[PDB]
Design a protein around this ligand. Structure first.
Ligand SMILES: [Ca+2]
Ligand SMILES: [Ca+2]
Lengths: 331, 330
């Protein structure tokens, strides 16, 4: 059978597809999303068209207010993209959180992040798909820090204390499934200060007032999640999926992963082959074994396996069985 | 069977769904280019969102070093575009609304007072709520950059794309799939987006570097080609329009106040002579399988959208219903 380990567009749960097949709703989707994550009533939830990239502009356009600076954490590619886009609207104060721990790539803990007092908000990316770096720490800054975070590749994989954030956004294409949809969770008191020239389609206050198909699909994905035991159940399953894959990579001298354990992503697992010359055959033999889209991003090279909610444990097992046999044959 | 006359979100063609029922992306653009005969000096962008985004996207990409643009107001969507443009420039408003033979009309293009300092000219060729269409082919000088919101009529007729600077259309109306917006832009207009234009709205960035609505559109474009293309579609829409307007005009019971020359072939608003019967018309038509005919809250009355996907059998069921309703309530 075929398993697709692509980071985006990512796979759709086996059942959602089937349900989609046999049934061929509206407002329920949002309620289900609020229920799944236990979103407090003081948070507005917006469903807008477009990918997550839009919010690289959306956040500064809605939250700078009359301020001209904002704190941005750089710990990888998407965080750096957010920063490049923010320069159009403010002078971001860049917090370089990249460090080496035990010879591997890691990220400084939040208490060491140097925030500036004039910052309009703080922005960070809890999961970098290309780098395989995750920041799982729950934010706990004072009530004067407005925390904004890009949860595109990890929303719905673990419980989340939404109350600790100002804005949480996520393109639906990675961990939810349907492409073309973006979710924005926004603390209500932050509404009302969008730049006068912010396009209406990006204005949180305007959208807060006044339905695709990706909406329907997501609706089914939320029901499926609830039926699986929700975000707590998904967290358990993802924890085992990650352990199985990282376990195989670490017990082999043939496969390598250079990210500190505390910052290892549970959704995107990049790895290299010790003998780099075998990359071609690895991609050819894996592809010819039902294991799709493993080539790492051009920027980094190597291999990358995305194991989102939709990816079952059987899919990860097939990948690991293949890696072991391949090392057995080329090692 | 059920026929849905909603202006947006709109109906999908029967075959596209059956084809879709079982079970790629790059052909979609080539098929769109071919349907409309888009010249090679135009870029075609497929992006997310509805057409509303372009109310901002056009001025953000085309103002350049100018601070004004000419905007034609002959309806609701044209007025909304103007309202959004005030965020980026001082629009020079051309009031094209006139009365002809006692009915709502639009001033011919040669009477549009253009400004020399304008970065472009914007107009809406088909107003869904007002049922007003401006079918005239633009033929302004080469110093006029014409931009237009074709959301509600794209693909319903042949179009001389070479006469425009930018043509944009949300797909939710005449193509079907919500979530997709198509922008056709003459390549020489690229490269002057405002430095603060968000990247998702920047034509130059989108051009430099896929959804499901993308796949559906591909099916719709293939379906259109199999029907004989835009020329065929135009012919069928003409007949659908003639039937609906014909029945409305031949009755004293139903009224439409739009001048013949500006009658939309896609959005047909109408009132009942005795408007107290509005509730009953909606309940009985809904019960007869004729859905979403309620005219927009503002204008009131009734409105039937008859896009490419709406077959003539649907228009005929609507008219047979209108005729029987007059028999029973007239
Ligand atoms: Ca290893
Ligand atoms: Ca009449």
């Amino acid at each position: 059978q075929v398993f697709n380990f692509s980071s985006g567009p990512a796979m759709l749960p086996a059942e959602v597809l089937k349900l989609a097949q046999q049934e061929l709703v509206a407002e329920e989707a949002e309620q289900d999303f609020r229920d799944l994550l236990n979103i407090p009533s003081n948070y507005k939830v917006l469903f807008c068209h477009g990918g997550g990239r839009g919010q690289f502009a959306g956040v500064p356009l809605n939250l700078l207010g009359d301020k001209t600076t904002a704190d941005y954490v750089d710990a990888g590619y998407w965080a750096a993209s957010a920063i490049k886009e923010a320069k159009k609207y403010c002078a971001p104060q860049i917090i370089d959180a990249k460090i080496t721990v035990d010879g591997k790539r890691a990220v400084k803990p939040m208490r060491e992040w140097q925030l500036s007092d004039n910052a309009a908000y703080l922005h960070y990316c809890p999961n970098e798909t290309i780098d395989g770096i995750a920041i799982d720490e729950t934010p706990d800054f004072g009530p004067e820090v407005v925390v904004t975070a890009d949860f595109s590749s990890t929303i719905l994989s673990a419980p989340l204390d939404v109350s600790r954030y100002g804005v949480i956004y996520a393109g639906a294409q990675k961990n939810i499934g349907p492409a073309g949809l973006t979710l924005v969770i926004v603390r209500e008191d932050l509404l009302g200060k969008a730049h006068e020239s912010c396009p209406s389609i990006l204005d949180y206050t305007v959208l807060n007032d006044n339905p695709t198909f990706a909406w329907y699909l997501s609706g089914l994905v939320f029901k499926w999640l609830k039926a699986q035991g929700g975000v707590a159940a998904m967290h358990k399953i993802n924890q085992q999926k990650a352990e199985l894959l990282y376990g195989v990579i670490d017990n082999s001298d043939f496969y390598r992963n250079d990210v500190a354990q505390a910052n290892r992503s549970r959704m995107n697992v990049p790895f290299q082959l010790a003998d780099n010359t075998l990359d071609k055959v690895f991609l050819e033999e894996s592809f010819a074994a039902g294991l799709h889209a493993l080539k790492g991003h051009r920027v980094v090279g190597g291999m990358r396996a995305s194991i989102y909610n939709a990816m079952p444990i059987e899919g990860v097992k097939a990948l690991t069985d293949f890696m072991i046999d391949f090392e057995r044959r080329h090692g």
